[PDB]
Amino acid sequence: ATSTVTGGYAQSDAQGQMNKMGGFNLKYRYEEDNSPLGVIGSFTYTEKSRTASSGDYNKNQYYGITAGPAYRINDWASIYGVVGVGYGKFQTTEYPTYKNDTSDYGFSYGAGLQFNPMENVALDFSYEQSRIRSVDVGTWIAGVGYRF
């Protein structure tokens, strides 16, 4: 058996919305007891509550639903390119008007890389990019956890 366990942050900042890293990631992987299979799936949830002029809600979230198996290359490595989906949500209006434009899924892809130097250290790294109306966005997850 093994359990990768990880401890890293989730950032998503964009050319018009510097939504600070107010979120984490985690992952889970089983080994199949009958094949060298794995899976990975990160989840991220960032939030930073926004007022401070007079009361203008600038709510959004960034979350990245990541999915796919893990492939057994040769020796001590596993890579898998995966999908992700990274977009804003909620809106900016506050006054009785509504505005509702930027809130509908984009397209992303990532990779699952998963590395183990030690027996209480594991680290893993993914990168995703999205293009929301020509707003350049960056998303990566990195950290350090433990190794079971």
Side-chain angles (χ1 to χ4, degrees), residues 19-128:
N19 291 307
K20 285 157 169 122
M21 63 297 197
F24 293 96
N25 80 83
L26 232 170
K27 286 181 182 162
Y28 194 90
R29 179 265 169 105
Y30 85 121
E31 59 177 17
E32 183 158 300
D33 211 40
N34 273 205
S35 293
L37 181 60
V39 288
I40 64 95
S42 46
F43 298 109
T44 55
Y45 169 71
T46 195
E47 197 198 301
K48 200 281 197 165
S49 28
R50 197 291 197 249
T51 193
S53 312
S54 195
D56 181 36
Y57 287 5
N58 285 237
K59 278 198 188 284
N60 61 56
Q61 300 174 153
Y62 267 88
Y63 78 103
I65 307 302
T66 304
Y71 195 71
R72 192 71 159 242
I73 313 180
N74 183 85
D75 68 285
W76 313 325
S78 293
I79 64 91
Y80 208 77
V82 287
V83 289
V85 290
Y87 220 85
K89 206 157 200 309
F90 290 108
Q91 75 162 317
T92 305
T93 189
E94 257 289 79
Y95 272 57
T97 306
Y98 272 40
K99 187 144 221 62
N100 298 88
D101 202 4
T102 323
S103 186
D104 202 353
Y105 84 112
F107 204 89
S108 180
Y109 60 96
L113 295 301
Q114 42 257 23
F115 187 90
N116 306 118
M118 225 68 70
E119 292 168 81
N120 90 310
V121 159
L123 64 177
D124 69 270
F125 289 99
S126 303
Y127 252 105
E128 272 184 61

Side-chain angles (χ1 to χ4, degrees), residues 10-22 46 48 60 62 128-130 132 135-140:
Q11 76 168 34
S12 194
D13 286 308
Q15 275 278 281
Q17 259 289 23
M18 293 181 172
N19 291 307
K20 285 157 169 122
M21 63 297 197
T46 195
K48 200 281 197 165
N60 61 56
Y62 267 88
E128 272 184 61
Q129 46 164 278
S130 288
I132 293 96
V135 177
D136 191 54
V137 190
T139 304
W140 82 313

